[PDB]
Amino acid sequence: MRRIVVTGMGMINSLGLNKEDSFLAIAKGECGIKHIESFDASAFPVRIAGEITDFDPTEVMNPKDVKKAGRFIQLALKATREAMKDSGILDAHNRCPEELANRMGVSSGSGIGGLGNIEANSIFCFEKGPRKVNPFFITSALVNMIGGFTSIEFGIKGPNLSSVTACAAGTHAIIEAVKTILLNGADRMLVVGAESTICPVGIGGFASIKALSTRNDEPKKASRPFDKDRNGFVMGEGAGALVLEEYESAKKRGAKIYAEFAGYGESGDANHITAPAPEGEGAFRAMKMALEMAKVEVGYVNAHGTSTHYNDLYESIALKNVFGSKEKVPPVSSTAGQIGHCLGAAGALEAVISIMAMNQGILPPTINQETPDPECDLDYIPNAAREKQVDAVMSNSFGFGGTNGVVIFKKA
Amino acid sequence: MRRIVVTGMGMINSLGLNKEDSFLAIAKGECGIKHIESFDASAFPVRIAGEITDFDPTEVMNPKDVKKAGRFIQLALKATREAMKDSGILDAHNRCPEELANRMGVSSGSGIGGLGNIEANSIFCFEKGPRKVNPFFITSALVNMIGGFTSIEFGIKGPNLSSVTACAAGTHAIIEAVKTILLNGADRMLVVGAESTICPVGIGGFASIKALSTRNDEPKKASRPFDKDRNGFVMGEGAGALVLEEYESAKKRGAKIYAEFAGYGESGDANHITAPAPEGEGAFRAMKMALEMAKVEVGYVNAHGTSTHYNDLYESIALKNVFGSKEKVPPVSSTAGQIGHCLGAAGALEAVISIMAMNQGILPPTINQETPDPECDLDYIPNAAREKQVDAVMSNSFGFGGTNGVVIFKKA
Amino acid sequence: SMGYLMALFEDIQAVIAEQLNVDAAQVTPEAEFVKDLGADSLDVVELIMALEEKFGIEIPDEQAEKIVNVGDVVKYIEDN
Amino acid sequence: SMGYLMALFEDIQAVIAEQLNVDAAQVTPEAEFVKDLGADSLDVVELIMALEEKFGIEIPDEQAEKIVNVGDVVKYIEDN
Ligand SMILES: *P(=O)(O)OCC(C)(C)[C@H](O)C(=O)NCCC(=O)NCCS
Ligand SMILES: *P(=O)(O)OCC(C)(C)[C@H](O)C(=O)NCCC(=O)NCCS
Ligand SMILES: *C(=O)CCCCCCCCC
Numbered sequence: 012m013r014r015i016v017v018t019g020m021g022m023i024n025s026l027g028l029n030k031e032d033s034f035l036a037i038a039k040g041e042c043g044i045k046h047i048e049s050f051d052a053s054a055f056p057v058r059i060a061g062e063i064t065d066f067d068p069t070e071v072m073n074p075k076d077v078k079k080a081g082r083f084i085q086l087a088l089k090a091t092r093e094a095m096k097d098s099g100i101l102d103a104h105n106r107c108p109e110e111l112a113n114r115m116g117v118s119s120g121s122g123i124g125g126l127g128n129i130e131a132n133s134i135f136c137f138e139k140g141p142r143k144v145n146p147f148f149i150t151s152a153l154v155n156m157i158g159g160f161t162s163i164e165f166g167i168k169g170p171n172l173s174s175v176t177a178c179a180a181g182t183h184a185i186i187e188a189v190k191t192i193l194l195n196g197a198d199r200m201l202v203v204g205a206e207s208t209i210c211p212v213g214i215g216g217f218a219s220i221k222a223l224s225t226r227n228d229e230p231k232k233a234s235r236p237f238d239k240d241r242n243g244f245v246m247g248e249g250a251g252a253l254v255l256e257e258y259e260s261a262k263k264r265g266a267k268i269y270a271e272f273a274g275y276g277e278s279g280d281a282n283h284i285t286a287p288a289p290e291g292e293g294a295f296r297a298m299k300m301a302l303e304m305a306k307v308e309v310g311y312v313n314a315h316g317t318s319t320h321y322n323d324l325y326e327s328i329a330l331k332n333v334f335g336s337k338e339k340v341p342p343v344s345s346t347a348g349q350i351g352h353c354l355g356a357a358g359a360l361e362a363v364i365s366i367m368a369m370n371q372g373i374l375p376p377t378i379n380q381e382t383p384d385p386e387c388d389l390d391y392i393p394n395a396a397r398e399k400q401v402d403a404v405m406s407n408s409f410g411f412g413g414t415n416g417v418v419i420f421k422k423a
Numbered sequence: 424m425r426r427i428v429v430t431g432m433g434m435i436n437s438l439g440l441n442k443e444d445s446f447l448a449i450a451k452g453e454c455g456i457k458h459i460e461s462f463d464a465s466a467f468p469v470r471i472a473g474e475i476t477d478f479d480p481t482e483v484m485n486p487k488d489v490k491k492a493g494r495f496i497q498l499a500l501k502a503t504r505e506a507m508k509d510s511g512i513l514d515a516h517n518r519c520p521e522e523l524a525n526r527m528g529v530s531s532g533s534g535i536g537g538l539g540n541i542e543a544n545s546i547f548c549f550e551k552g553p554r555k556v557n558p559f560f561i562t563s564a565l566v567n568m569i570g571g572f573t574s575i576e577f578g579i580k581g582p583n584l585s586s587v588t589a590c591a592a593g594t595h596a597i598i599e600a601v602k603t604i605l606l607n608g609a610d611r612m613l614v615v616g617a618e619s620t621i622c623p624v625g626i627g628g629f630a631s632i633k634a635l636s637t638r639n640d641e642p643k644k645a646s647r648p649f650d651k652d653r654n655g656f657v658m659g660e661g662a663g664a665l666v667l668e669e670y671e672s673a674k675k676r677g678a679k680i681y682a683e684f685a686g687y688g689e690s691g692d693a694n695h696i697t698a699p700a701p702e703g704e705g706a707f708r709a710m711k712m713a714l715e716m717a718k719v720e721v722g723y724v725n726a727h728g729t730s731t732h733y734n735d736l737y738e739s740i741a742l743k744n745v746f747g748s749k750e751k752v753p754p755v756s757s758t759a760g761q762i763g764h765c766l767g768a769a770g771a772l773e774a775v776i777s778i779m780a781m782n783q784g785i786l787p788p789t790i791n792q793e794t795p796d797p798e799c800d801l802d803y804i805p806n807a808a809r810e811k812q813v814d815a816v817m818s819n820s821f822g823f824g825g826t827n828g829v830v831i832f833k834k835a
Numbered sequence: 836s837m838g839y840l841m842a843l844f845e846d847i848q849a850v851i852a853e854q855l856n857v858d859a860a861q862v863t864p865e866a867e868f869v870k871d872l873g874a875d876s877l878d879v880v881e882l883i884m885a886l887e888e889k890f891g892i893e894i895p896d897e898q899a900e901k902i903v904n905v906g907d908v909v910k911y912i913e914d915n
Numbered sequence: 916s917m918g919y920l921m922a923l924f925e926d927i928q929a930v931i932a933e934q935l936n937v938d939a940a941q942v943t944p945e946a947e948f949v950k951d952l953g954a955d956s957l958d959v960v961e962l963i964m965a966l967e968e969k970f971g972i973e974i975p976d977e978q979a980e981k982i983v984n985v986g987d988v989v990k991y992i993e994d995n
């Protein structure tokens with residue numbers, strides 16, 4: 012129907028402040044996992060995370076407004092600024108031109124948003140009463156304030172939408188923006204997934220369900236998707252952003268074309284609140300619908316691959332079932348070894364990584380591959396990047412509640 | 424595009440446990456706002472709220488599971504069960520039939536989800552360490568766990584989506600469901616908006632920005648949309664649910680047809696993080712695109728009408744501007760006087776209310792109209808229900824971040 | 836202390852029955868949590884937490900993985 | 916306590932400039948927050964709250980409501 016292209020991209024994570032530094036480090040197999048220093052984790056069973064240590068919020072927003080945004084929003088403003096500037100849309104005042112503004116919206120994704128801000132104000136209220144609740148609390152913490160702050164920063168007035176589907180939020184935010192443009196609700200959409208939940212109650216929430224790796228002595232070796240010695244994910248923080256644009260409108264503008272959206276799929280397991288469906292059946296169906304909509308040959312799969320026992324196993328089964336056999340599965344890698352699993356932000360970050368991999372003919376590797384898992388027997392691009400040109404890339408995301416999202420982007 | 428109908432409806436709020444009792448009490452101009460009892464609010468500047476005092480979670484789920492779901496999810500399970508039975512779609516075992524399960528999804532809406540649960544576990548972790556964070560914390564609090572628990576409860580395996588656009592979430596949940604059916608991503612969608620935030624940090628958050636009414640002495644007169652003595656909203660809890668179905672699919676299986684979806688509009692102000700755009704400019708565009716999209720004569724408008732000075736003013740200005748003059752605005756009312764403003768759930772509750780008003784030729788009134796506000800000069804159906812047959816109804820929702828959603832339903 | 840042992844065992848039984856919403860009739864010392872009591876991974880870790888609070892005990896995680904039937908938990912409580 | 920009053924004025928001017936990202940210089944006695952300091956309704960409430968904390972005081976809601984210029988808050992804290 013209407014064709015949609017990617018015309019700008021940005022990302023920030025524990026291996027870089029922009030997409031060129033970050034992707035280069037990811038492709039070389041570096042690892043940004045470190046010991047948690049953003050709070051005191053001395054007494055915690057999990058003390059490692061993909062923390063971003065060189066991020067200065069003052070460089071993205073006025074100091075007065077910094078206290079008005081949870082960290083996840085600060086990271087979203089960094090990623091979207093990079094993508095909007097990257098797109099060439101912005102005028103001399105770094106605004107959307109007033110005559111394009113009503114047809115450019117924003118689709119944001121996050122799992123919980125400002126958790127640390129709710130935690131901090133919950134404790135203020137409990138210790139010293141509601142008079143100690145900070146007035147900037149609510150608007151610093153709500154997931155949709157990603158789109159609130161970004162739409163204001165860029166003057167974009169189209170549909171302002173926000174997805175909160177757990178670890179698949181970043182990917183659903185892409186799909187909802189695609190749907191909006193397909194139904195002529197917008198000509199352009201800013202997409203951004205963002206998450207920052209490295210805080211006591213966040214780490215504690217995932218450790219009490221035993222979903223986090225406790226390889227505290229070697230942080231850079233704890234996140235190891237598909238490896239036999241994996242033992243839980245490592246939580247990362249970050250944000251990825253994309254500008255989607257209707258094709259004719261992109262060409263007319265003179266936009267640069269990173270990729271053209273090809274297909275998507277969405278499903279629910281209706282099985283368990285945290286574990287995936289047997290055989291990754293819901294993932295299978297989402298990948299199937301995406302593949303049948305795209306009608307292309309996928310040369311690279313960026314898997315969700317969080318480094319838990321259940322997710323890597325059942326994603327590999329579903330992959331093998333959807334492509335037909337193990338040999339028929341394209342090269343797959345999860346970059347969660349490099350930057351941690353960034354939850355809500357993961358799908359957005361991993362779409363940027365996937366597109367960049369296609370732009371450059373460099374497929375990033377799944378790191379810390381040391382002991383083959385007989386149940387995980389796909390080609391995971393082990394330890395080192397694979398120079399290979401591909402014509403289309405697929406990115407998978409799954410979240411608690413059994414919600415699944417898949418997107419495919421093809422060469423321009 | 425594909426035609427879409429509402430075939431089942433449910434709701435629970437401070438005036439009823441089901442849509443029949445609730446709507447009757449609302450059309451009667453009754454008021455469910457009470458002194459807060461769910462927590463000790465004695466030291467709080469705001470001590471009133473739309474509390475549901477007769478809801479029993481063990482009637483919607485087994486006792487073992489109640490601990491696993493925040494109150495907003497419990498209310499959602501109540502509302503969706505009602506709507507799923509009403510729709511007549513459930514098999515002999517109260518599940519969606521398997522042959523239809525893959526093509527029925529869920530679109531859920533909430534603003535913050537399980538705030539009380541995040542608050543509790545934040546304090547547990549701040550008093551006894553991370554080992555005291557309950558394993559059921561995360562999946563009890565995430566907004567998309569509405570879709571999580573409901574999809575498992577009814578075995579629906581289609582797209583599982585979640586909107587978190589603050590006070591407009593319930594309306595965006597409807598629209599995302601419509602988008603999904605229109606693009607053939609599903610044949611049916613369970614829609615549900617649910618919110619329950621009556622807790623210390625929830626009340627304190629809104630009090631600290633002076634958003635809430637402090638008329639604690641008369642909880643029945645506190646909420647007064649468009650009245651000259653309005654002085655802030657009253658927080659309400661509840662959930663509303665719809666079953667949407669592609670029109671031919673509903674005819675084939677002989678479904679009850681409450682209404683047909685007619686049009687929608689979505690926009691962002693890109694102006695301010697809490698205050699409405701001047702002249703309701705963003706709200707105007709969303710309303711105009713829903714009206715241009717529905718191409719029907721709207722006989723009744725359920726306004727957002729939260730009973731704040733700025734919102735009710737700027738919504739009234741946008742209403743006159745979009746229809747042409749105050750004389751050309753159809754009859755309008757806000758039911759937030761009756762049940763409070765239910766935040767992310769309001770858009771879902773207010774669509775059920777609006778369709779039922781159309782079904783029964785009874786337009787509910789805006790209560791507590793005691794002093795005309797010269798700036799708010801519309802026909803707000805003051806104090807008493809009006810008998811009028813309408814052929815189309817429009818429902819408005821706006822949220823923090825300047826995000827706007829509008830839907831129109833037409834008589835079947 | 837036969838009486839003390841009986842008391843401790845009855846406390847454990849009540850706790851398990853309340854958590855899993857199962858009758859104390861089905862909680863046999865040989866009863867398996869997943870097969871015989873309808874509990875999953877999440878239910879187990881939450882039950883172990885309640886027991887540690889219900890008895891001020893602190894089971895290490897390593898040993899907690901090594902639980903299959905209610906008997907293992909009751910024995911561990913006995914060793915207390 | 917003229918010197919004490921002067922120190923209090925200095926502290927209040929510092930707090931205001933920090934919360935509104937403005938130079939103390941702009942914090943004149945006749946300084947309206949919205950027109951002269953670039954503050955809005957949200958900035959105003961959080962500013963008044965920082966004062967209460969920085970000065971361990973409690974501005975009742977009525978006096979806080981009438982605050983228009985820096986000098987209003989200044990007087991209130993003087994008569995504290
Ligand atoms: P149980 O055997 O269900 O164990 C509960 C846990 C939390 C381990 C759950 O099953 C699980 O593995 N959840 C994570 C599944 C996953 O990888 N999700 C992607 C986001 S972490
Ligand atoms: P400031 O003068 O902006 O005061 C902030 C308040 C909290 C009054 C805010 O602007 C406000 O009330 N905004 C719009 C009211 C509204 O739309 N409410 C529904 C969501 S709370
Ligand atoms: C992913 O689907 C499982 C984790 C949910 C992500 C949301 C982060 C909230 C942290 C408490």
Ligand SMILES: *C(=O)CCCCCCCCC
Pocket residue numbers: 149153534535538588589590591620624625626628629766767821822823
């Ligand atoms: C509506 O737009 C106001 C913001 C609603 C946020 C959700 C409620 C949680 C705050 C206690």
